[PDB]
Amino acid sequence: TFSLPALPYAYDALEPSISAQIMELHHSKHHQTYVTNLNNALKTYSTALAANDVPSQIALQAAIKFNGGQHINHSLFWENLCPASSPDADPASAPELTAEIAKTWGSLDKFKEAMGKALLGIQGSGWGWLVKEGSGLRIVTTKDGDPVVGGEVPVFGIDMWEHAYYLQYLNGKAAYVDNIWKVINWKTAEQRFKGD
Amino acid sequence: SVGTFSLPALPYAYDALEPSISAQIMELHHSKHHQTYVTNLNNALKTYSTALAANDVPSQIALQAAIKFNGGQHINHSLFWENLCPASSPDADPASAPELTAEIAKTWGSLDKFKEAMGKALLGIQGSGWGWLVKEGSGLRIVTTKDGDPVVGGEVPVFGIDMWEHAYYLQYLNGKAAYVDNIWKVINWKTAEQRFK
Amino acid sequence: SVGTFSLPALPYAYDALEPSISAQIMELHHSKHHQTYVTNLNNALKTYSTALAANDVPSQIALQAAIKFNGGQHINHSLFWENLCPASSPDADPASAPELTAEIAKTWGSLDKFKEAMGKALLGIQGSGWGWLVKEGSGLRIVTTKDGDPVVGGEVPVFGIDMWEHAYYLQYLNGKAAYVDNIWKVINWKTAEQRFK
Amino acid sequence: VGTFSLPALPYAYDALEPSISAQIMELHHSKHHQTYVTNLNNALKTYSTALAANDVPSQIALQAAIKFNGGQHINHSLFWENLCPASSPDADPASAPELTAEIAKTWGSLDKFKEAMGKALLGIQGSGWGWLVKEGSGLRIVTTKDGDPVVGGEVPVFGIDMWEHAYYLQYLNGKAAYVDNIWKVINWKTAEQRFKG
Ligand SMILES: [Mn+2]
Ligand SMILES: [Mn+2]
Ligand SMILES: [Mn+2]
Ligand SMILES: [Mn+2]
């Protein structure tokens, strides 16, 4: 059975970038619901699979991809976030990653601008990702609850669903993107970039 | 002149839909979200005028997302304000839609059964989108559209409900089910009847 | 166990639908295309069984496209063969579907008007897909599905027409309008009536 | 507005045999591509009215026709130019020095590139195209669905049409044999000019 992962920090640890109210609702309400609906969908699909019930399996695909994708995405999200005062929020905790970032985009600032443009370009709900595809780095977006497709390894992701910022920033998603860089966990991003 | 759309005034004050929809949501939804759609729509249409005259198909294709999203949201929200009214108004009474409710009961069994089917479609939207009651010929149908897409050609919208998180989050938080439960009290059946007929 | 689907036999010989659909098309469509959908559906379902036992959600999501496409095409083509019959058969006469044709004329005005609306939807499909007459509750509706998608849950298919290019190209080349014109002669209205009822 | 024309082929209809039959080449160019050009012109002329009339619902409804027919006009125009007789020096991979160098740099070799491209081509569900594109300085294999053109930011180097009408008359359901034989008629000279300029 899948479970809601515990946060590595308190609900207010990401302030003033992300409010404590958003963090508590995002984790204890939104993410918690994805886990519940994922387990419910998988149990129903198990019956349809054994019964060779293809129509029911097709009907359950949306629930498994959405809730399974959001559970994957939010689990990554909490781990590539950290308090702004921690050394893990310093990009110097990611020597190899930032080196490849500067090789691909020119500089860290240029990468942040391109990432921000992709994040703000999402129409509706979705996520923005820095992913590793082969040996290079790439900025991709995913719609709704879709996870990153097979072949791209997520380095870090930023949730652009309105529930990720609306209570604090209202419709001003640009301010949310500008301020979220202060709480990006570059230690986790370096760990994912290197892999094993 | 191309790209001369404007933000339409609400048929009511910002607090007229309380307690179903808060004045804070109505003001932000209308004066910020809808206004931004109008602005981005006009700019996109003006750029398209140049690409169309120059027979620039690549530029025309690239501008389609902005026109469908901002033009659709301008269409959808303009319809939205008009199929909403204060809960104490006679237009909020389903008896203001004799022909519509008659077809609703013939199609779903009852108004309550239709409300249950509409609610499941609204709450079933993954991500951002709208839920609609549409007219196709003589029958009625419940459809959903994603993001800012408008209802496709051939189906005539009767009324719509915005399921974007900005439509309820400040008041209802993650409780979108409660938002749908309370929005039935402010549905303008008089407007829905006029569109149906 | 998991993944034990088989290719259903045709209700008629490969040349039984001529001159509407050629014997070469019928044999290739059934023994090659449909057989491939059945095989790839079984393989996808067996691979999913492995991913499910391993609690591998990413692998499960990756397999969804293969299951929907091959499972949908297996459902769609199985329906397709059943709503086709020789033009000289009594099942090919629209009088074999009294209740269906009555609702068709009530919804579109006449059978010819319905054929006009169905043909435009069929010819309007961009790329590969199907056109369907479906039952949604008590009403009738014309819908299209893309690639191998089946009709969504809630709509009951009455009959379908395959608009993939492989369904007509060998006989009609790019003239899909002639393909639609001639396929009405081999529609099995008896099966369509049974599905409607 | 909307005055596009069908481009003439650089060769006779039978010049690509035995890889692509003369019957396919004539139908593909004189029938399929010509219809894309015509329907692109019709959509652009209709859009001029909707644009001047500020008819956003009609403009959104016309987007599919403009992207589909405009994309297919772009795709097929590129297609004819990256095809040439197998006996031509342009069919030899040495005609694209800068291009073929990056191909071996990105995939390892030309054969490795053909294996990856073929899998992408055969993996398309329904109708679509497979492309080798240049993004910045690197190369990538991408696919486009139905009539979509290559996205902005990627420069098409050459494309292979995987619509069933591109091979069905000659290869039937064997799209794998179609991909295997089309490598003999790829015009690397045009692919080099697109890669550089
Ligand atoms: Mn979220
Ligand atoms: Mn809205
Ligand atoms: Mn078929
Ligand atoms: Mn083609």
Query: Which domains are assigned to chain B?
Result: 22-85 (1.10.287.990), 86-197 (3.55.40.20)
Task: Using alpha carbons, list the distances in angstroms from residue B188 to A112, B10, B12, C177, D114.
Answer: 46, 13, 12, 44, 60
Task: Give residue D36 CA to ligand 2 midpoint distance, Å.
Answer: 37
In this structure, what DSSP letter does residue A35 have? H
CA dihedral D150, D154, D155, D159 (to 10 degrees): -40
Query: Residue D188 burial by CB count (10 A; 0-12/13-18/19+): exposed, middle or buried?
Result: buried
Amino acid at residue number D147: G
Q: Which two tokens stand for residue A169?
A: 């920033």
Map tokens 């689990």 to a residue. Answer: A75
Give the torsion through C-alpha atoms of B119, B124, B128, B129, to 10 deg.
-50
Q: Is C120 on the interface with D (CB under 8 A)?
A: no
Output Rg (C-alpha) for chain C, integer angstroms.
18
Helix (H) or strand (E) holding D47, with range, is: helix D34-52
Instruction: Decide if B114 contacts B94 (C-beta within 8 A).
Output: no
Q: How big is the CA angle at A170 (ends A165 and A171), to the nearest 5 degrees? A: 95
- Cβ contact B38:B5 at 8 Å: yes
**B2 exposed, middle or buried (CB, 10 Å; 0-12, 13-18, 19+)?**
middle
Sequence-distant (≥ 6) Cβ neighbours of residue D185 within 8 angstroms: D16, D19, D20, D83, D84, D85, D86, D91
- Residues contacting C53, CB < 8 A, separation 6+: none
Taking the CA of C21 as reference, the closest ligand is 3
DSSP-derived letter for residue D126 is: S
Which ligand is the nearest neighbour of the Cα of C145?
Answer: 3
Q: Rounded to a whole number, what is the distance in Å from the CA of C29 to chain D's nearest CA?
A: 9
Taking the centre of ligand 4 as the mean of its atom positions, its distance from the CA of residue D166, in whole angstroms, is: 6
Which class for B153: exposed (0-12), middle (13-18), buried (19 or more C-beta within 10 A)? exposed
Q: Comparing C-alpha atoms, which of C60, C143, B121, B126 is closest to residue A61?
A: C60
User: CB–CB of B80/B162 below 8 Å?
Assistant: yes
Query: Which residues are CB-contacts of A23 (< 8 A; sequence separation ≥ 6)?
Result: A7, A11, A12, A13, A14
Count the Cβ atoms, other than its own, within 10 Å of residue C95: 8
Asked if C40 and C67 touch (Cβ cutoff 8 Å), the reply is: no
**By the 8 A CB rule, do D187 and D11 touch?**
no
CB atoms inside a 10 Å sphere around CB B171:
18
CB atoms within 10 A of CB D115: 13
Give the determination technique. X-ray
CA-nearest of D111, D156, D105, D159 to A136 is D105
Largest CA distance in chain C: 55
Q: What is the distance between the alpha carbons of residues D121 and D160, in angstroms, rounded to a whole number? A: 8
Best mutation target among D56, D144, D146 (most B Cβ atoms within 10 Å) is D56
C20's tokens: 């509407």
Report the distance separating Cα A7 and Cα A12, nearest Å: 11
Backbone Cα Rg of chain D: 17
- Comparing CA positions, the residue from B110, B125, B99, B113 lying closest to residue B189 is B99
Query: Which helix (H) or strand (E) covers residue C145, if one does?
Result: strand C139-146
**Chain A adjacent subunits, 3+ CB pairs under 8 A:** B, C
Say whether B136 sits in a helix, a strand or coil.
strand
The candidate with the shortest Cα–Cα distance to D152, out of A106, A125, B51, C127, is B51
Q: Cβ of D27 and C129 within 8 Å?
A: no
**CA–CA separation, D13 and A174 (whole Å):** 55
DSSP string, C176-188: HHHHHHHHGGGB-
Exposure letters C39-75 (e unless 16+ CB within 10 A, then b): bbbbebbebbbebbeeeebeebbbbbebbbbbbbbbb
DSSP state letter for B146:
E
Residue C133 tokens read as: 């007459």
Count of CB atoms within 10 A of residue A106's CB?
A: 11
CB B99 within 8 A of CB C131: no
- Partner residues linked to A184 by β-bridges: A81
A26 alpha carbon – ligand 1 mean position (Å): 6
CA–CA distances in Å: residue C149 to residues B141, C40, C152, D160: 21, 15, 8, 25
Give the sheet arrangement for strand D138-145, strand by strand. Answer: D138-145, D128-135, D154-161
Dist. CA A129–CA A133, nearest whole Å:
12
| Minimal-distance CA residue of chain C relative to B139 | C139
Cis peptide before D85 (omega within 30 of 0): no
Q: Do C157 and C78 form a contact (C-beta atoms < 8 A)?
A: no
Question: What is the C-alpha separation between B146 and C170, in angstroms, rounded?
Answer: 38
Mutation target vs A (from C61, C69, C74; most A CBs, 10 A cutoff):
C61
Q: Do D173 and C164 touch (CB under 8 A)?
A: no
Shortest CA distance from A42: residue in chain C: C52
Residues in chain A: 196
**Which of these, B144, B119, C60, B145, lies nearest to A41 by C-alpha position?**
C60
User: Is B34 marked as binding a ligand?
Assistant: no
In the block, tokens 């992408």 appear at D120
| B83 within 8 A of B192, measured Cβ to Cβ | yes
Continuous segment of H or E residues that includes residue D9? none
Ramachandran area for residue D19 (φ above 0: left; ψ -120 to 50: alpha; else beta): alpha
Name chain D contacts of C30, Cβ cutoff 8 Å: none
Closest CA to C91 of C15, C193, C14: C193
Dihedrals phi, psi of A128, to nearest 5 degrees: -115, 140
* Six token digits for residue D45: 């002329």
Bridge partners (DSSP) listed for residue A153 = A132
Amino acid at C195: R
B93 is in an annotated binding site: no
Whole-angstrom Cα Rg for chain B: 18
> Which residue out of D146, D167, D169, D171 would a mutagenesis test of the C interface target, given it has the greatest number of C Cβ atoms within 10 Å?
D146
3-state secondary structure of A71: helix
Residue D21, helix vs strand vs coil: coil
Min Cα separation B15/chain D (Å): 30
Nearest CA in chain A to C154: A59
Ramachandran sector of residue D59 (left: φ over 0; alpha: ψ -120 to 50; beta: rest): alpha
B147 and A124 within 8 Å at the Cβ level: the answer is yes
Q: Are A91 and A84 in contact (CB under 8 A)?
A: no
H helices present in C10-163, as ranges: 23-28, 35-53, 57-62, 64-82, 98-108, 111-124
C-alpha R_g of chain A: 17
Q: Which of A29, A144, A171 sits opposite B126 (nearest CB)?
A: A144
Cα A175 to Cα A170: distance, rounded to the nearest angstrom: 10
Q: How far, in Å, from the CA of C162 to the mean position of ligand 3? A: 6
Residues 6+ apart with CB under 8 A from D115: none
Separation CA A137–CA A105 (nearest Å):
9
State the count of interchain CB pairs (< 8 A) between A and B: 53
- What is the DSSP secondary structure assignment for residue C125, as one 8-state letter? -
Q: How many angstroms separate the CA of residue C148 from the nearest CA in chain D? A: 8
